[PDB]
């Protein structure tokens, strides 16, 4: 649909933080739409890029891809501007065929969105314990 | 046996510190069980890995191996997160044959556990004086 | 944690279907835990594989990876057993560094779990309209 300010709520370890993302256009070279947090510093923005890919003569499948990039800043003694210490990434790729109905795709999407709240996933992502 | 929280007591130069270690699963690739301190920072954890090794066509002996890794953190002026300055290691390997009884193995284990409290060893490990 | 049946609820286009997944062990060759639907046919199972990866001398980052595979069956006139016509895939990879706290990782996880319910994502995944 149309790009708009996505204001996601109830985020975090406790569940009280919010994240508002402003749209920043669609890249014409590769068809990748971008959104970022209004933090006003071009290196310290939490950003989300979403792009759907048409079929070619080499893929023949629809490919949806979502990337989330979150950098962490730190102030320094030796400089007055903060720098990027580390970044956290997330990369989701859906691959659907040329005959799939929308019920199957909504089942995959809601299965992933409900499976990222399981105790298995909140123990394997947060505390990094293998499933055992 | 079953992995469990090993809460070792009376540790240190004076003998009053305790160390509680939580289990973090068994690595399926090489059969190495891990335990670590609940310090909640994935780089600043004191960790202990124990693994027993079955005989192969190249070793034909049972091999028990215990590793202890203790990193030391330091805060910095220039960053807000602490980093690892140095690490202390320990590596114990027991090698038993295919005909050894359990009394011999308990003799080796308790000999090492009582020999790590001798004045020779607490002078050679703590103060790093050669035996002379 | 430990593998156990994961009975996910309120799934689908309408929001009323449930999916119960039974654990089927951990692969020792690569450390990939598997779960699948109890559909009793080994080719028609909706399956989910989750695996976390330790650092090596070539990656030096923790890598969590989740795969979802959903096949669709169809009966045939010419055979008595159903076959797999097509499959729907999903592949999520989290890449965290060696100094990240758990609040940042929970922020990434809950950001993705709340961002898969936005109108942008339910219009780009379901109806396949570009943004």
């Amino acid at each position: 649909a149309k790009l708009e300010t996505v204001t996601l709520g109830n985020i975090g370890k406790d569940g009280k933080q919010t994240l508002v993302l402003n749209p920043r256009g669609v890249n014409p070279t590769n068809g990748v739409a971008s959104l970022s947090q209004a933090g006003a510093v071009p290196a310290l923005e939490k950003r989300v890029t979403v792009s759907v890919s048409q079929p070619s003569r080499n893929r023949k499948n629809y490919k949806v891809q979502v990337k989330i990039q979150n950098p962490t800043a730190c102030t320094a003694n030796g400089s007055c501007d903060p720098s990027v210490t580390r970044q956290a990434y997330a990369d989701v790729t859906f691959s659907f065929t040329q005959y799939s109905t929308d019920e199957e795709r909504a089942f995959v999407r809601t299965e992933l969105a409900a499976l990222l709240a399981s105790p298995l996933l909140i123990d394997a992502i947060d505390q990094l314990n293998p499933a055992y | 046996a079953k992995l469990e929280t090993v809460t070792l007591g009376n540790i240190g130069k004076d003998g009053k510190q305790t160390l509680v270690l939580n289990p973090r699963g068994v690595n399926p690739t090489n059969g190495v069980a891990s335990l670590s301190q609940a310090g909640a920072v994935p780089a600043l954890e004191k960790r202990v890995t124990v693994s027993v090794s079955q005989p192969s066509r190249n070793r034909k002996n049972y091999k028990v191996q215990v590793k202890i890794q203790n990193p030391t953190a330091c805060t910095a002026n220039g960053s807000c997160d602490p980093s690892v300055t140095r690490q202390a290691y320990a590596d114990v390997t027991f090698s038993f044959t295919q005909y050894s009884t359990d009394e011999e193995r308990a003799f080796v284990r308790t000999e090492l556990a009582a020999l790590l409290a001798s004045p020779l060893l607490i002078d050679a490990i703590d103060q790093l004086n050669p035996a002379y | 944690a430990k593998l156990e049946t994961v009975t996910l609820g309120n799934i689908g286009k309408d929001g009323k279907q449930t999916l119960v997944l039974n654990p089927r062990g951990v692969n020792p060759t690569n450390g990939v835990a598997s779960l699948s639907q109890a559909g009793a046919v080994p080719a028609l199972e909706k399956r989910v594989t989750v695996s976390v990866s330790q650092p090596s001398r070539n990656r030096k980052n923790y890598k969590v990876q989740v795969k979802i595979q959903n096949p669709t069956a169809c009966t045939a006139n010419g055979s008595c057993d159903p076959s797999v016509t097509r499959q729907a895939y999903a592949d999520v990879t989290f890449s965290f560094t060696q100094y990240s706290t758990d609040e940042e990782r929970a922020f990434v996880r809950t950001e993705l779990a709340a961002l898969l319910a936005s109108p942008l994502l339910i219009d780009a995944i379901d109806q396949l309209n570009p943004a």
Epitope: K13, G15, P119, D126 | - | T5
Partner: antibody
Amino acid sequence: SEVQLVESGGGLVKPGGSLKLSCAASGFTFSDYGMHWVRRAPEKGLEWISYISSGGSTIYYADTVKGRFTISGDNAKNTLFLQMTSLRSEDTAMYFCARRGYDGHHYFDYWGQGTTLTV
Amino acid sequence: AVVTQESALTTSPGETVTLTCRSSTGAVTTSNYANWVQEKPDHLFSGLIGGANNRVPGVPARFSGSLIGDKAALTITGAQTEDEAIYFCALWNGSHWVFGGGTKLT
């Protein structure tokens, strides 16, 4: 709506074993729900006993109990079993049953009313 | 988290109040799936608030779960007179669920 009730059992059993707790589920089915057992000692706090999950594939048995209780389910008539072999020392409780809900959702959400089983 | 503990405080009807649930060994985390149980004094229990933020359908809107600090919290906004009960806590320590003592809200 959905009302649970546990009534089977509650006799003055000698310390030898051989009793059965059972509850009947009304507003749901055991296809996508699991059931807990908790144990309120007559003046202490609650204590979790055991759990079968949805469909009966993962069973736990907290380690004061494992070996001498058995929990099972019977999908005909929608009932939930609890069959032991010994009643050793205390085992005095209003035994409640909980209905572990959906997986991202609440895990002790629609309770029973308890049966007093004295040894 | 082999044992857990909380207080037995009380409050007036005319403003908010919080309830902590402190794990004895270390801190609570996301893996400690913390959810709350409400007991009306006919020993009629009820599920109150799920693990992350969730509520049981039927629980009113003046109820929120938290991870304030190192303790699983329970914020009741404008506590009226009908929830004059005792509240129970729960943690999964990796092997078995652990319930705590009550909190006699009056």
